[PDB]
Design an enzyme around this catalytic site. Structure first.
Site, PDB file in Angstrom:
ATOM      1  N   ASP B  25      28.354  90.088  -6.069  1.00  0.00           N
ATOM      2  CA  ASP B  25      27.780  90.410  -4.780  1.00  0.00           C
ATOM      3  C   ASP B  25      28.369  91.642  -4.112  1.00  0.00           C
ATOM      4  OD1 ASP B  25      26.555  90.320  -2.333  1.00  0.00           O
ATOM      5  OD2 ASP B  25      27.549  88.498  -1.677  1.00  0.00           O
ATOM      6  N   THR B  26      27.656  92.760  -4.206  1.00  0.00           N
ATOM      7  CA  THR B  26      28.121  94.004  -3.590  1.00  0.00           C
ATOM      8  C   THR B  26      28.100  93.937  -2.082  1.00  0.00           C
ATOM      9  OG1 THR B  26      25.909  94.951  -3.772  1.00  0.00           O
ATOM     10  CG2 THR B  26      27.447  95.364  -5.604  1.00  0.00           C
ATOM     11  N   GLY B  27      27.375  92.964  -1.518  1.00  0.00           N
ATOM     12  CA  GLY B  27      27.316  92.773  -0.077  1.00  0.00           C
ATOM     13  C   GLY B  27      28.449  91.946   0.493  1.00  0.00           C
TER      14      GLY B  27
HETATM   15  C1  LIG Z   1      25.068  89.436   3.349  1.00  0.00           C
HETATM   16  C2  LIG Z   1      26.026  88.525   2.636  1.00  0.00           C
HETATM   17  C3  LIG Z   1      26.514  89.107   1.329  1.00  0.00           C
HETATM   18  N1  LIG Z   1      25.581  88.697   0.257  1.00  0.00           N
HETATM   19  C4  LIG Z   1      25.587  87.225   0.055  1.00  0.00           C
HETATM   20  C5  LIG Z   1      24.930  86.595   1.260  1.00  0.00           C
HETATM   21  C6  LIG Z   1      23.429  86.748   1.137  1.00  0.00           C
HETATM   22  C7  LIG Z   1      22.692  85.915   2.163  1.00  0.00           C
HETATM   23  C8  LIG Z   1      21.243  86.287   2.196  1.00  0.00           C
HETATM   24  C9  LIG Z   1      20.822  87.446   2.819  1.00  0.00           C
HETATM   25  F1  LIG Z   1      21.702  88.265   3.408  1.00  0.00           F
HETATM   26  C10 LIG Z   1      19.491  87.793   2.841  1.00  0.00           C
HETATM   27  C11 LIG Z   1      18.546  86.978   2.254  1.00  0.00           C
HETATM   28  C12 LIG Z   1      18.945  85.812   1.641  1.00  0.00           C
HETATM   29  C13 LIG Z   1      20.286  85.473   1.614  1.00  0.00           C
HETATM   30  N2  LIG Z   1      20.660  84.289   0.961  1.00  0.00           N
HETATM   31  C14 LIG Z   1      20.532  84.222  -0.407  1.00  0.00           C
HETATM   32  O1  LIG Z   1      20.148  85.152  -1.105  1.00  0.00           O
HETATM   33  C15 LIG Z   1      20.870  82.858  -0.930  1.00  0.00           C
HETATM   34  C16 LIG Z   1      22.045  82.894  -1.898  1.00  0.00           C
HETATM   35  C17 LIG Z   1      23.373  82.998  -1.239  1.00  0.00           C
HETATM   36  C18 LIG Z   1      23.679  82.216  -0.146  1.00  0.00           C
HETATM   37  C19 LIG Z   1      24.920  82.317   0.435  1.00  0.00           C
HETATM   38  C20 LIG Z   1      25.855  83.180  -0.077  1.00  0.00           C
HETATM   39  F2  LIG Z   1      27.052  83.242   0.530  1.00  0.00           F
HETATM   40  C21 LIG Z   1      25.561  83.954  -1.179  1.00  0.00           C
HETATM   41  C22 LIG Z   1      24.314  83.864  -1.759  1.00  0.00           C
HETATM   42  C23 LIG Z   1      22.081  81.732  -2.834  1.00  0.00           C
HETATM   43  C24 LIG Z   1      22.435  81.980  -4.145  1.00  0.00           C
HETATM   44  C25 LIG Z   1      22.487  80.934  -5.040  1.00  0.00           C
HETATM   45  C26 LIG Z   1      22.189  79.649  -4.630  1.00  0.00           C
HETATM   46  F3  LIG Z   1      22.245  78.637  -5.519  1.00  0.00           F
HETATM   47  C27 LIG Z   1      21.844  79.391  -3.323  1.00  0.00           C
HETATM   48  C28 LIG Z   1      21.794  80.438  -2.427  1.00  0.00           C
HETATM   49  N3  LIG Z   1      25.418  87.162   2.554  1.00  0.00           N
HETATM   50  S1  LIG Z   1      26.374  86.055   3.470  1.00  0.00           S
HETATM   51  O2  LIG Z   1      26.067  84.670   3.160  1.00  0.00           O
HETATM   52  O3  LIG Z   1      26.211  86.580   4.805  1.00  0.00           O
HETATM   53  C29 LIG Z   1      28.074  86.334   3.012  1.00  0.00           C
HETATM   54  C30 LIG Z   1      28.532  85.843   1.809  1.00  0.00           C
HETATM   55  C31 LIG Z   1      29.850  86.063   1.458  1.00  0.00           C
HETATM   56  C32 LIG Z   1      30.691  86.759   2.305  1.00  0.00           C
HETATM   57  C33 LIG Z   1      30.220  87.247   3.506  1.00  0.00           C
HETATM   58  C34 LIG Z   1      28.905  87.034   3.865  1.00  0.00           C
END
Ligand SMILES: C[C@@H]1CNC[C@H](CCc2c(F)cccc2NC(=O)CC(c2ccc(F)cc2)c2ccc(F)cc2)N1S(=O)(=O)c1ccccc1
Ligand SMILES: [Cl-]
Ligand SMILES: [Cl-]
Ligand SMILES: [Cl-]
EC number: 3.4.23.16
Lengths: 99, 99
Positions: B25-27
């Site tokens: 996850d680059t984000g």
């Molecule tokens: C922006 C950040 C950084 N990328 C990760 C995540 C994406 C969230 C996101 C978006 F932004 C926009 C559109 C959709 C979504 N969600 C997914 O795509 C679901 C997905 C997921 C959920 C939570 C997660 F933690 C990581 C991945 C998922 C994968 C496999 C599964 F089986 C079930 C779910 N966020 S975060 O939660 O805030 C965060 C994570 C870590 C550290 C800081 C912040």
């Protein structure tokens, strides 16, 4: 281009005639942008992850320009703390992870 | 390897002698894994996501193999929806975004 990950991969995007800064996020399935007006129909959706879920508006067939590369897809609009370019649009610009 | 983003970029990691699946996850600034036992002392940390902030346990200098590449660094443990490899370790394995 080749983007290293020493810092957050923030890029300038153009959406709905506005210039915004957004994060290239391989961990996001969808693209989510902070509150703004977009044309066309929309439907409600819930997206979640760390910290829980938020309600967003789903707009389809929206054009975004990311680093000079045009891409079309679904854009979610809602109370996100950062504009995120998710996989649905990263694939369209031919973005890959390499190591 | 070169990983496209048409599907979630899930890879096998090895931590504490156990194989687990994790998302590149680059984000994400940091690496966060689901509840497990890790050695040493931990420090408090808050991480902000789409839905708000959560408390996690910060462990330092943890040995982790990511898609066969060795990394040693900070690993957060908490109620994350999936195991996430963030930029702190993606940089260690020389991961870049390319388009
Ligand atoms: C922006 C950040 C950084 N990328 C990760 C995540 C994406 C969230 C996101 C978006 F932004 C926009 C559109 C959709 C979504 N969600 C997914 O795509 C679901 C997905 C997921 C959920 C939570 C997660 F933690 C990581 C991945 C998922 C994968 C496999 C599964 F089986 C079930 C779910 N966020 S975060 O939660 O805030 C965060 C994570 C870590 C550290 C800081 C912040
Ligand atoms: Cl789409
Ligand atoms: Cl492709
Ligand atoms: Cl680290």
């Amino acid at each position: 281009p080749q983007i290293t990950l020493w810092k957050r991969p923030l890029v300038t995007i153009k959406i709905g005639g506005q210039l915004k800064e957004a994060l290239l996020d391989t961990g996001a399935d969808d693209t989510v942008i902070e509150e703004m007006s977009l044309p066309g129909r929309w439907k409600p959706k819930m997206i979640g992850g760390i910290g829980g879920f938020i309600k967003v508006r789903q707009y389809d067939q929206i054009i975004i320009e990311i680093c000079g590369h045009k891409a079309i897809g679904t854009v979610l609009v809602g109370p996100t703390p950062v504009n995120i370019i998710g996989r649905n649009l990263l694939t369209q610009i031919g973005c890959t992870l390499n190591f």
